[PDB]
Amino acid sequence: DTDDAWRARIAAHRADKDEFLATHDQSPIPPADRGAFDGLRYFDIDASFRVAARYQPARDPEAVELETTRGPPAEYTRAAVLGFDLGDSHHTLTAFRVEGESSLFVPFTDETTDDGRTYEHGRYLDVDPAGADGGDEVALDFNLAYNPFCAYGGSFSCALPPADNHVPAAITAGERV
Numbered sequence: 001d002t003d004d005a006w007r008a009r010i011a012a013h014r015a016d017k018d019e020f021l022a023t024h025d026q027s028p029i030p031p032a033d034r035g036a037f038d039g040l041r042y043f044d045i046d047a048s049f050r051v052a053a054r055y056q057p058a059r060d061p062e063a064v065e066l067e068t069t070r071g072p073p074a075e076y077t078r079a080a081v082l083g084f085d086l087g088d089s090h091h092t093l094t095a096f097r098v099e100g101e102s103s104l105f106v107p108f109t110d111e112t113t114d115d116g117r118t119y120e121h122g123r124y125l126d127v128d129p130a131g132a133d134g135g136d137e138v139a140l141d142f143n144l145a146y147n148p149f150c151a152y153g154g155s156f157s158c159a160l161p162p163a164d165n166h167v168p169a170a171i172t173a174g175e176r177v
Contacts, residue, residue, distance in 0.1 A: 007045055010143055014042060028149040028156065040147075041176045049142035049173035053084040055130045061097065066107070069121070069150050070157035079104050082127065084140055086169045093165050095127055103128050107161035108145075110171040118176050119151045122161040125174075145174025 018039040021027045029037050057080045065073035076096040083092050095104035103126040112118040123145045130138050148158035 003047070006050070010045055013144075014040070028152050028154050030152065030154045033153065043143075043172045043174060043176055045143050046173050049086070049171060051084045051086065051140050051142075053082040053127075053138050053140040055136050055138045056081040056083060057134070064096070066096075066159040066162065068157045068159050069148075070155070074157075074159045075099075076105065076159075080129070082106065082138065082140060086167070086171075089169060091167050091169070093167065094162060105159075106165070107159060108165045108167055108171075109161055110167040110169060112170055112172060112176070113166075115170075116177070117172075118174075119147050120177075121148065121150070121158070122165075123147060123174060142171050142173040145171065147175050147177075151177065 021029050021040065022034070022037050027034065058078050062078045064076055064078045066076060068074050076098055078094060079097040080095045081092050082095055083090065085091070093106050093108055095106045098105050106125040106127050107122055108125065109122040110118070113120065113122055124147070125140070125142065125145050127138055127140060130136060149156035150158045
């Protein structure tokens with residue numbers, strides 16, 4: 001519940017992910033790059049990007065498809081809208097339900113996408129859904145934003161964020177390029 005515990009949790013995740021990427025046979029870092037790999041690059045932790053979002057579940061969960069970088073569209077269900085403030089501006093993102101996954105999938109772009117500090121196709125956030133009867137407020141921590149596998153140069157097919165999931169602000173938290 002404390003700031004120090006939150007920060008330690010983020011640091012532990014980042015360290016553990018670096019070790020997996022560096023050493024595991026199932027790492028998405030391509031073999032050619034695994035030798036020189038020295039860890040992912042991140043923005044420093046910034047609590048201004050850990051925000052409370054209003055959770056607004058889709059009234060009639062609808063089957064939707066997102067385009068992918070390779071091959072056929074990915075199938076998801078439109079699950080919710082998440083509404084949140086960054087500074088003095090209000091923003092919304094659509095969250096998607098992925099079959100067999102409990103967390104919602106929130107692909108997005110922002111101003112760092114445009115200025116080249118983060119991955120050009122966008123980043124991903126996983127958001128754990130509120131209570132099912134009937135939740136309304138969830139933790140949106142952009143310090144946990146991460147790159148699609150195709151950012152690392154492998155031949156993966158990754159879902160592209162919808163254009164509606166652009167956030168007109170510089171989200172200087174999470175994984176960079």
